[PDB]
Symmetry: C4
Subunit: 215 residues, 4 copies
Amino acid sequence: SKDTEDSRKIWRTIMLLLVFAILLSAIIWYQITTNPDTSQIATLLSMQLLLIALMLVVIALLLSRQTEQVAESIRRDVSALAYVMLGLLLSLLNRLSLAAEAYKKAIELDPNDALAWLLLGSVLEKLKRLDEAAEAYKKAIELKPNDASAWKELGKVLEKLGRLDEAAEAYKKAIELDPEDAEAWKELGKVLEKLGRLDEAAEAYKKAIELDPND
Amino acid sequence: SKDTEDSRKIWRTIMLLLVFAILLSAIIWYQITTNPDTSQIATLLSMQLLLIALMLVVIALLLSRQTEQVAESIRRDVSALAYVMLGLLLSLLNRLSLAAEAYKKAIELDPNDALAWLLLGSVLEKLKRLDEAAEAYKKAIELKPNDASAWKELGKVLEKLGRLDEAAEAYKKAIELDPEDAEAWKELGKVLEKLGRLDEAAEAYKKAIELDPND
Amino acid sequence: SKDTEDSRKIWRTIMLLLVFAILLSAIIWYQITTNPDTSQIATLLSMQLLLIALMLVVIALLLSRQTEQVAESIRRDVSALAYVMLGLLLSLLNRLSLAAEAYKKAIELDPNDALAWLLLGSVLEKLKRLDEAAEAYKKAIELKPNDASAWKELGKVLEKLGRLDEAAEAYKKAIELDPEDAEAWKELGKVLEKLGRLDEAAEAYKKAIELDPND
Amino acid sequence: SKDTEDSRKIWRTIMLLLVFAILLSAIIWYQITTNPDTSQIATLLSMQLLLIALMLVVIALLLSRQTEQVAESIRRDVSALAYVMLGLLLSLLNRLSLAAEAYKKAIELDPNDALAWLLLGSVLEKLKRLDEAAEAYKKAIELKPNDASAWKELGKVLEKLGRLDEAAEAYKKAIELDPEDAEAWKELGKVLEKLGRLDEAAEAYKKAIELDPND
């Protein structure tokens, strides 16, 4: 919201430069009429003209700054979307290492781009960069706590890392967010079975079968 | 067309600030020559200078505003296309929940983006969000009444919702718009048969077969 | 190149508004020193101030115009690329009617976008809009006479339209541009055979086989 | 960093135009009070007004220039990403010749776009433009010396060109950068065997098998 604050400061600055020159000019109009002495009258006109000159230059400097501020903001916002989109295209051609870089660039431009973080996570898992993938998913999840897909995907990475207990918890969270996700239920089952949690595993397996009879 | 109206107001404002200063300055040129009294002459010069100072500041404020107005309009238009495109890419990777969000964002930026509405509809159906899908298709159709594809897709959602009568009507409209759409004819047939409208179902089935002998 | 011409006119205008005010101001500096009469001196100062006031307003109006001109040019260029890209994405999801509209939009924004014309052609053929497809390909070809792919694709549309003679010519042109295109050779063969041009058909068939022994 | 240098020159110019007018105006305020002679006082006011007029015009010209500089920079950066993205989409539809052109355009806009160079390389290989592909890969590699994928892809082009020795070296570099790349190891093996380097070929083949038992 800094732009709102800065905009108000810019407007106030322009106003104040003029108001000062206005008030003095109004004073001078009176003073010139009152005291008919060229050497005082002209001195006041020179001062008025000087204040105006400064005012206008400062204003031009403010226009320059605002033009740049606006333009940079747009450049950034456009680029961040372009990098996410680029990563998606690179991923479609299986240019996974390059896709990861594109997502990384979107993140640097906008660190709370949960999508870029999620997608980075996916690419890193596909590239077998499992530890880095888990961290990327963790970030996407903190940004969006109710992203059931991110939770499920985290689950898969954690299982691959041998983190069966944490994997089971991540799958369980995806399920609470969306109980019909038969895949999540089956994968939860697999983790629980592997983990020795046979009764829970059996229930998870059953839910995948029962929830959608055409799975 | 508000921008056209605002542009005209901005131009008129700049013109009027100057015209007032012009007319007065022309008056002052005469008055100075006519009445050779420094205390009156300078008073008029001070006033002229003040009007100019205000004029120029106001103009600078208008330049600032117009710069921002133009820039924001562009940012919005660019972003709305980017969100539709993003949704399409996310859909290609089967990131359907995320694709739906991207289409939603395009809609908020432009509520009459029939494409975003149609596509949202498609994603929602694929995600089994059938009631929401029907509403999204309805919006796309109101925006584009002769979108035969949107009508056919609405038909599919309505049938899935058990709305066989409404589904048959939606398929029929797609067909009137494009009579060669064998798929629409076959799907119409399926609805009509399910609906007990056996004679109409038979005709619809026949048209799908007859319209294109290599279907 | 109109922008170059307009830019020069804008610069010249700004220069001339100032140069006139400069020359007169220099004249006035001399005249004030020479003729010590307040009623003449001030009259000249008022005139100088008025010319400056006009100059600056006109300049501000020019800044406004140039800002808008630049911004609009960019908006158009960005949008035209976005529409081609959109059409390609819609085509990947088989949203062919929508893909055609996106290409059409790119064309309206830039009528010499051979790519958009070519792609439109392709979509129209896929949509069975063969007559329209032939015209779109014709436009892409006039824009790029050495686009062997566009010539081959035109060939396919023309054959589908029953225009076997014109199809054979379009295939032949694609071949002259790229003689190794075994597909073009085979398709030329098919047209020539269908057309009764059996000796030429035989040669075309042989070239497809001989050019690349692993075709 | 030229923009930083130019920005500083623009700011300094605006400052200096004003500072000169300030210093002189301050001098004039004193001189008017000191020497009560209209013909000298007004001469100084005219001069002050002239300096201001010039200053403001020059500033407006600088605003115009900066607006254009900023806008052009953005246009270029946006377009270069769009061309890479366009090439990727064209490649997905197998519009390879067109994809190559899009990558070429991105390169002209930004000659150190390693991604565009790499991708161009890939398209050229797919299009059987092997000599050109090798050069494009060489450029991508010089820009990014630790792009293991670019090294492997260069390897494939070089082998296709009959350059078995250079191909083996390119594959070896990809392997040093990423030792788990079983594909690179197998392809290295194939080159080494073809090249008569049977003992090295055997080791390379073994590594592909041993590195990932599920390859």
